[PDB]
From a paper:
Copper-containing nitrite reductases (CuNIRs) catalyze transformation of nitrite to nitric oxide, which has impacts on geochemical, agricultural, and medical health fields. Each protomer contains one type 1 copper (T1Cu) and one type 2 copper (T2Cu) site. The Cys residue forms a peptide-bond bridge (Cys-His bridge) together with one of the His ligands at the T2Cu site to transfer the electron to the catalytic T2Cu site, which is coordinated by three His residues and an axial water molecule.
The Ala residue does not coordinate to the T1Cu atom, thereby greatly suppressing ET from T1Cu to T2Cu. NX joint refinement was performed using reflections up to 1.70 Å resolution for ND and 1.30 Å resolution for XRD data. The ligand was modeled as a mixture of a major NO2- ligand (occupancy 0.7) and a minor water ligand (occupancy 0.3). The neutron-scattering length density map shows that the nitrite ligand is in the deprotonated form (NO2-) rather than in the protonated HNO2 form; thus, it does not form an H-bond with AspCAT. The NO2- ligand shows a κ1-O coordination manner with Cu-Onitrite distances of 1.8 and 2.7 Å. The 2mFo-DFc neutron-scattering length density map shows D atoms on the two N atoms in the imidazole ring of HisCAT, showing that HisCAT is protonated in the substrate-bound state at pD5.9. In contrast, AspCAT is in the deprotonated state.
Numbering used by the authors:
A (entry chain A), B (entry chain A), C (entry chain A): 16 to 315
The structure:
């Protein structure tokens, strides 16, 4: 199922290019590209990606920012596109395909705070998402979250599935072969990883005893819902889709639809390693367990 | 799997009969009947229906109305029944079977506002729902919704699945063959369609640039949950199950359980065509994409 | 898939041992043990259990209680452990394995009110949960629920799945063979049952006409989400995860993630039998229907 023009193609990852161009305007450039990713040990997936990552690179903007987004398509044969769930846009004008070896620029506002999925909008969308063209954009609320002052440390986690390679029958009728977490960096020194079964087990996220941790999370699917849970704690506060108004307290587990996001906050009271799972345990067994290592210093 | 007495049977659809009989009392009559529906192009399903539609015809009542419901059973051999999720009733007295060629009348109050599933209660209920005996009843809140004055246009959407014809093994162990949206008319001129893979793509719902749209939605299943999302917008306000108290804001995607409902509202800011999906993309690929065409005038 | 050391093993159920040892401290002792349970008529599952029940015995504590938990492992060969979702603990110190024929004691606080899953934490956790090592701990809120004074009668229900016996491939890739409810006693005279397809149909929970019923519910999975619904009523009030702050009203159906809990309350207005389902009807057909028998006296 590897089309002829993708055989042997492995386009090196490139950094996200993003810069502020006004008090409420930002530029973002990504590149659709075909990149080999090791999704499980010994298992390479020649992913359809933004910038050579799957999920793609994290985007963070402020509520009220207009995004002037450029997609460069490095794929030699397949068109690609971008749909940000954060934005108000005309899908048939603003989320349209960019042909191989071309670029397109689209402009649209991010009016709403939260933790939004982004993904390719090219038909069949299932094929583009399943092959790796998904990611998260965070829109920071102008008025913050009411618990901001309580948070000591924060990370981003994303859940996705992987199927048999570029197999539309499997994508629409089969169980996922792997379900995985990745983490995308918010600040210098944070890990930045791809959706695989092992990295966040072997290189756990780090925290310090007694801290309140915030996670910005999204389940990008393509197909499954997520029962998000941190072992050994309870979520003090949850904001559904990251909108400050959608405020729950004391949740053991947060139900995320496909493309669903949340801001979750919890306290780690003792040193140790804390697993992070989807509690749909078939998916956890197939890769969807990350680890948080809590030490007396917060360093390894 | 087409029982002998249903071979060749295709009972013409009939309109819903409903009339108000007091300030807080309504009469409703439906007919259980066997009707061929084209669920995908070239694919006829000899559905078990209310009134020859699947999902069945929309019912709208006011909070506090008592419903005097009559079911006429036109099926030559299978008993059928009605369960409205809106009502407080004794299931073993009020949701009981009506035999072939008979009628039954049942009375019960709709005390609670919202967007409720209805379906046959005859065992096996899975068989009756999967074969098409599902629908929505809307109960309008006595005090409205706090965002009523902001809404410019409204429609009803229903999600359902279709399986291999009358195949209980597939119904309980197989993936859906199709997942579909339909729209049921609230006002004269609104579309009224059945659950199929194509009608709401080829004949999109219509709206005008700048409008706030309300959708009354329910995922009737039988089996799947729904990750309901409108491309190119964000839900300004969501009322879970259509109860005004269950008020979320700024949701990208609304998680609906099987039988779950919602009132969702969103703004369309630019001309274009806006897909409406379940973001469980295996289901979207198998039919569950509707379209909203937004024009400068709101007409086609 | 019955390991040699479990052949012929059927360890008799034993009562939960629990006692208060201070105003905010309790002792609890359980025993990991291998016990034959009839999950469907004629179908024995040699379950991995706490105390010979699956789901395990109900635990009820007060918000702010510290639990001094002892696990005795009667399994001749497999290690087992305990993870309470109620507690703040170090998973790698406090949820660790107890070897065959050994005991371990762990201490941790239940700081948060609600209806929490508990289960074994031994890897693979999917295997331990699927084989029966799941249950519920209720933590009573110090300030109650705002609707406490309206409730006439209460019960606990738990949803779980059963798969092919000890079959890891089926656990992670197959549909459940059975999906079931059980009820765990809160007060003397309440039923106390295991997850099976039939007991709560043949011996329904009892209530009286006009009562407001509270159910403490949790869907322990391992793998499925639940669309929890009581036929013939609407939930007056719902508290997600049993936290009083997470308060919804007038819900027809409550979406529970895997491990998700709730307190749900509803009124039964007429005599009759009221089914209780997950509205994912493939699961209901495979066992997940319980009954509530409502009589003029509340007795049978
Ligand atoms: O609570 N994680 O199994
Ligand atoms: O956001 N619809 O893929
Ligand atoms: O509403 N139970 O089918
Ligand atoms: Cu610009
Ligand atoms: Cu793509
Ligand atoms: Cu999307
Ligand atoms: Cu009448
Ligand atoms: Cu029927
Ligand atoms: Cu129902
Ligand atoms: Cu002690
Ligand atoms: Cu165990
Ligand atoms: Cu758990």
């Amino acid at each position: 199922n590897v089309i002829a023009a993708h055989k042997g193609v492995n386009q090196a990852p490139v950094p996200l290019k993003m810069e502020r161009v006004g008090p409420h305007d930002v530029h973002i450039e990504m590149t659709a590209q075909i990149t080999d990713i090791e999704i499980d040990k010994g298992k390479i997936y020649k992913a359809w990606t933004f910038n050579g990552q799957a999920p793609g690179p994290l985007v963070v903007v402020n509520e009220g920012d207009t995004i002037h987004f450029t997609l460069k398509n490095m794929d030699p044969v397949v068109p690609h596109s971008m749909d940000f769930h954060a934005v108000h846009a005309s899908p048939s004008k603003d989320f349209i395909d960019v042909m191989p070896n071309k670029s397109g620029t689209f402009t649209y506002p991010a009016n709403k705070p939260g933790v939004f999925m982004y993904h390719a909008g090219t038909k069949p969308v299932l094929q583009h998402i399943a092959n790796g063209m998904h990611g998260v954009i965070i829109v920071k609320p102008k008025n913050g979250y009411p618990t901001d002052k309580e948070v000591d440390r924060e990370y981003v986690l994303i859940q996705n599935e992987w199927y048999k390679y570029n197999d539309m029958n499997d994508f629409q009728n089969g169980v996922p072969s792997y379900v995985v977490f990745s983490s995308k960096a918010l600040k210098p020194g944070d890990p930045n990883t791809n959706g695989d079964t092992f990295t966040l087990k072997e290189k756990p996220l780090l925290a310090k005893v007694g801290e309140k941790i915030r996670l910005y999370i999204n389940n990008v699917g393509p197909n499954e819902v997520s029962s998000f849970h941190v072992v050994g704690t309870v979520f003090d506060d949850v904001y559904l889709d990251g909108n400050p108004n959608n405020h729950l307290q004391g949740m053991q587990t947060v139900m995320l639809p496909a493309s669903g996001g949340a801001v979750v906050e919890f306290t780690v009271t003792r040193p140790g390693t804390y697993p992070i799972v989807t509690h749909q345990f078939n998916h956890a067994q197939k890769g969807a367990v990350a680890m948080l290592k809590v030490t007396e210093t917060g360093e390894d």
